C-alpha cells in the first residue's frame, strides 16, 4: 500500500508541498506559538531553534524540502527544515543538530553543509480524525543507510528559552500551517 | 536536608495553593490532555474520572485540599481531589478510589463520601529539572513509617477511555497547571 494517505497534509487539509513554506505549530498543551529563532549564549545571533512563548505568534515561516524531484512530501521520507529568513549571520537556511553542553540541540550553522548533514528530519504521523498532526524525527548519520530513532523535543533553558533539542522520552506533536 | 520545594509546586515554579483550582496534565505530551469525567459502565452519569485524549485540552479545573488549616500543600501530605465543576448528578466534587472487577478505579460518587474515603492521595515528586513534576498514589493508612507504593495510572478501555485505576501500568506523571 503505497497511498495518498501517506503524504503529509497541512491544517488545511492541502498537501504539503517540497519546498513549499510553512509554520510549524506544537500541538501540546502547554500555550506559546510557532518555531522561530533566538540567540543564546556564546551566538553573535540567534542561531538557536526555538519555539515561540508567544502565542499569538506563528512562528518563522520554514521550508521543508527534499532534494528528489518529487512534488508532494511522504511521511518516512527524509528532509531537510530550514527557514525561509534566516539571521543575516547563518549560512544557509538550514537547521542541523549539533550536540551541545546541554545536549543534541536544533540550530542554524555559520558555515554551509552538505546534504548528508541537513537531510536529517522526517515526519511521523500521530492518528486523530479530521486533523494532521506529526511527530518530528531526527536521524543521524548512520553512515549510508539512515537511521530516525530519536525525537525532536523541547527543553526549557535557564532564561526560558523553549530549545528544540534531540529527546528520548518527550517528542513534541506538531501540525503544519501552510505560510501565505 | 531540607528546602521548601518540600511543599507542592506548581508548572510555573509557585507553590500549590490549598484549595486552589489546577489543570492535571502530563509530563510528555504525546499521553494527552488534562483530566476529566466520561460515563461509563451502567453510569447513568459522568462519573468514571479520565485523561483527556486531546493533547491540546487541559482537561477539568481540579481542586487540591489539604485538610488542614495550612495555605500551602506540603509533600508527603494527604490531599484531596475534585472536580471544582463537577456533573449534577455527582453528590460532591470529590473523587474516590472504588473496587470494581477490573481493579479499584477513580470514580465521582452520587452520594455524600466520609472524610476517609476522599482524603486518599498523595503526590510523590520525581526529581529532574526545574519543572516540578508529581506521581499520584493511593494510600488507605493510619499511624505508620513506610512509604505508600499504591501508584494510580492509566488503562484505556474497550471504547477508548483513559481511565485513571490504580495500577502499575501508565503511571501518571504529573505536572500541576494553575488555573484562573
Ligand atoms: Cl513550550
Ligand atoms: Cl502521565
Redesign the pocket.
Known amino acids: 500500500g503505497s497511498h495518498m494517505d501517506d503524504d503529509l497534509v497541512d491544517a488545511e487539509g492541502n498537501l504539503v508541498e517540497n519546498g513549499g513554506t510553512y509554520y510549524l505549530l506544537?500541538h501540546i498543551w502547554?500555550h506559546?506559538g510557532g518555531i522561530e529563532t533566538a540567540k543564546t549564549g556564546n551566538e553573535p545571533c540567534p542561531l538557536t531553534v526555538v519555539?515561540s512563548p508567544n502565542e499569538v505568534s506563528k512562528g518563522e515561516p520554514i521550508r521543508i524540502s527534499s532534494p528528489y524531484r518529487i512534488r508532494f512530501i511522504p511521511r518516512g521520507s527524509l528532509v531537510a527544515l530550514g527557514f525561509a529568513n534566516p539571521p543575516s549571520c547563518a549560512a544557509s537556511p538550514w537547521w542541523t543538530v549539533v550536540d551541545s553542553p546541554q545536549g543534541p540541540a536544533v540550530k542554524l550553522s555559520q558555515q554551509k553543509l552538505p546534504e548528508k548533514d541537513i537531510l536529517v528530519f522526517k515526519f511521523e504521523k500521530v492518528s486523530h480524525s479530521n486533523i494532521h498532526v506529526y511527530k518530528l524525527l531526527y536521524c543521524q548519520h548512520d553512515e549510508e543507510d539512515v537511521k530516525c530513532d530519536q525525537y525532536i523535543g523541547?527543553h526549557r533553558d535557564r532564561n526560558g528559552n523553549?530549545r528544540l533539542v534531540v529527546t528520548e522520552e518527550n517528542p513534541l506533536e506538531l501540525v503544519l500551517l501552510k505560510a501565505k
Open positions: 506544537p502547554a506559546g519555539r523541547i523553549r
